[PDB]
Amino acid sequence: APTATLANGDTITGLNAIVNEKFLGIPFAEPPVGTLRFKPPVPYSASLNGQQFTSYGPSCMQMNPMGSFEDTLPKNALDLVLQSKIFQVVLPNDEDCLTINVIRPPGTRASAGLPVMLWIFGGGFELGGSSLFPGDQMVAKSVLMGKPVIHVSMNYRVASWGFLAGPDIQNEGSGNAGLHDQRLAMQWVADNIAGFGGDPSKVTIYGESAGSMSTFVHLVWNDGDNTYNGKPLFRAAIMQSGCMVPSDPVDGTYGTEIYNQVVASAGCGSASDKLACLRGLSQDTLYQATSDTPGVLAYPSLRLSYLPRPDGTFITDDMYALVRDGKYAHVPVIIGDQNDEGTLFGLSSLNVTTDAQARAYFKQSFIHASDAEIDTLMAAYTSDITQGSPFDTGIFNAITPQFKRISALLGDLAFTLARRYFLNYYQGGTKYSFLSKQLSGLPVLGTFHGNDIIWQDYLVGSGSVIYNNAFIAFANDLDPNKAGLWTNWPTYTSSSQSGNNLMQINGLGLYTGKDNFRPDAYSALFSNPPSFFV
Ligand SMILES: *[C@@H]1O[C@H](CO)[C@@H](O[C@@H]2O[C@H](CO)[C@@H](O)[C@H](O)[C@H]2NC(C)=O)[C@H](O)[C@H]1NC(C)=O
Numbered sequence: 001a002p003t004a005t006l007a008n009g010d011t012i013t014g015l016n017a018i019v020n021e022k023f024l025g026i027p028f029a030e031p032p033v034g035t036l037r038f039k040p041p042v043p044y045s046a047s048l049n050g051q052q053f054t055s056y057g058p059s060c061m062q063m064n065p066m067g068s069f070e071d072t073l074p075k076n077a078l079d080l081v082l083q084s085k086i087f088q089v090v091l092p093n094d095e096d097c098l099t100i101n102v103i104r105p106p107g108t109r110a111s112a113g114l115p116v117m118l119w120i121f122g123g124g125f126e127l128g129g130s131s132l133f134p135g136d137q138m139v140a141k142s143v144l145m146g147k148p149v150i151h152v153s154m155n156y157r158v159a160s161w162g163f164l165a166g167p168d169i170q171n172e173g174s175g176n177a178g179l180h181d182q183r184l185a186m187q188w189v190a191d192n193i194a195g196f197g198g199d200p201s202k203v204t205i206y207g208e209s210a211g212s213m214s215t216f217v218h219l220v221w222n223d224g225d226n227t228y229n230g231k232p233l234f235r236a237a238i239m240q241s242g243c244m245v246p247s248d249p250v251d252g253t254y255g256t257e258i259y260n261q262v263v264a265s266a267g268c269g270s271a272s273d274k275l276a277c278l279r280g281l282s283q284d285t286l287y288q289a290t291s292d293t294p295g296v297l298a299y300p301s302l303r304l305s306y307l308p309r310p311d312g313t314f315i316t317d318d319m320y321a322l323v324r325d326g327k328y329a330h331v332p333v334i335i336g337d338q339n340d341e342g343t344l345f346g347l348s349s350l351n352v353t354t355d356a357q358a359r360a361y362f363k364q365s366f367i368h369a370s371d372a373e374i375d376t377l378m379a380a381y382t383s384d385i386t387q388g389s390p391f392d393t394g395i396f397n398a399i400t401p402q403f404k405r406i407s408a409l410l411g412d413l414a415f416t417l418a419r420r421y422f423l424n425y426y427q428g429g430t431k432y433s434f435l436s437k438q439l440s441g442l443p444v445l446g447t448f449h450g451n452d453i454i455w456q457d458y459l460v461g462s463g464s465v466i467y468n469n470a471f472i473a474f475a476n477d478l479d480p481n482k483a484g485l486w487t488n489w490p491t492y493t494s495s496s497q498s499g500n501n502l503m504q505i506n507g508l509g510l511y512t513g514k515d516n517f518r519p520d521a522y523s524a525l526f527s528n529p530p531s532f533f534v
Pocket of ligand 1: 352
């Protein structure tokens with residue numbers, strides 16, 4: 001059986017998985033139960049010497065997405081979404097869920113000093129677990145190309161458990177509990193990965209969707225000071241769909257609103273100390289109360305009930321202002337998107353069919369946007385179906401007269417155009433950006449949000465050369481071109497720089513393009529980012 005040593009020298013036993021070695025379910029924090037609910041994680045101090053870690057531990061409590069894909073999608077599109085496992089609750093789950101897992105090449109010794117790819121799963125900040133989105137394919141490919149890496153994944157609290165907000169949470173300084181979980185795991189890696197054969201100074205953090213936004217957050221965490229024990233917690237970052245979270249502070253309007261609902265539904269409305277009452281709830285009651293707020297696939301959609309919010313200390317301010325003001329770590333980065341990020345989410349408002357309904361929907365989703373700003377917005381994103389997402393599909397995929405429009409808007413604000421704003425202001429290091437169109441032609445969704453997960457962890461596709469090969473090269477040499485791809489990946493400086501600045505993917509292979517599309521939408525959304533925060 002494979003073995004490894006921890007920071008204090010304790011020895012643990014792993015699992016020989018034939019194609020790789022795994023150390024699963026390692027506790028990195030005291031169970032965030034009872035009194036510790038909503039609070040940052042406390043490091044685990046009990047000795048693990050002589051123990052075995054051959055199985056995943058449970059995921060953190062999961063919030064039902066409240067969506068319905070197998071009711072609106074045709075077979076081929078549905079099959080791919082299911083294969084990606086995106087937005088699917090992970091079982092079993094429990095509040096005692098803060099474990100970390102390590103996957104390494106077989107025969108890896110403590111002296112290997114391999115680069116470490118620290119993965120942050122994405123599940124809309126309301127569900128998900130480290131057990132899904134397997135790193136096996138990444139590791140196998142790193143070995144095949146002679147640039148072996150160690151894959152690390154951690155669970156972090158989601159929904160109310162990890163992102164409860166409101167005035168009480170803020171006054172206590174407990175905003176963004178789930179992000180703290182991720183932060184502690186990163187510190188855990190700094191202190192323990194060497195004993196598994198990894199090099200703590202070669203950590204590349206990466207994530208998809210909520211995990212990509214989390215990765216970005218880690219760049220601006222504590223205003224860009226990512227040092228721990230005197231050393232950077234990571235040397236690079238990869239963002240697969242998402243960066244800045246367009247959100248108001250912890251004690252803002254919607255955070256307080258969602259909090260009041262949880263408190264009321266849990267039977268704590270008459271408590272003199274609301275937080276203490278919530279902390280004294282059975283696991284089931286807190287779960288039920290949480291189930292009484294909207295899930296990610298429900299009508300409010302990307303107006304998430306739970307998501308990272310500026311707290312003033314760890315995420316000190318409006319995340320868009322953080323990047324403009326340079327409060328970030330200086331590391332090279334890769335950040336890309338799937339051509340049609342918003343299709344999955346647009347499926348949550350198929351009852352919005354008229355221009356008037358669309359306007360009403362945007363107004364309720366963006367409580368800070370004036371009528372004038374909404375006008376400009378609806379002029380940038382028209383009802384002309386040929387201009388919506390799936391992009392460049394003409395009259396096709398218009399399941400409703402507004403689906404392609406709403407999809408385009410939501411995908412751009414949450415992912416694609418937000419990325420351009422990040423790239424335009426970020427000067428922390430060399431930047432590389434990609435835009436996938438690998439699934440062009442796929443009815444209804446197109447190259448949808450999360451499809452990269454399939455080609456990164458389950459199947460080999462044209463995009464795999466990027467999600468695997470290029471990413472591994474980046475984690476190894478801080479340059480995706482060391483992957484030896486037959487198409488050079490140009491560096492990105494600004495959305496108006498000369499020539500092609502995006503590595504792109506089609507059904508067969510690679511090519512490059514320009515990040516110059518939908519400019520009026522970019523200006524309509526970001527002339528004042530806060531007007532479109534949730
Ligand atoms: C589309 O359907 C959603 C889901 O039912 C509607 O949202 C609900 O509307 C009712 C009545 O207006 C509210 O009491 C609920 O709180 C809403 N639920 C959610 C998920 O927020 C929405 O109004 C419909 N939109 C249109 C254009 O008809």
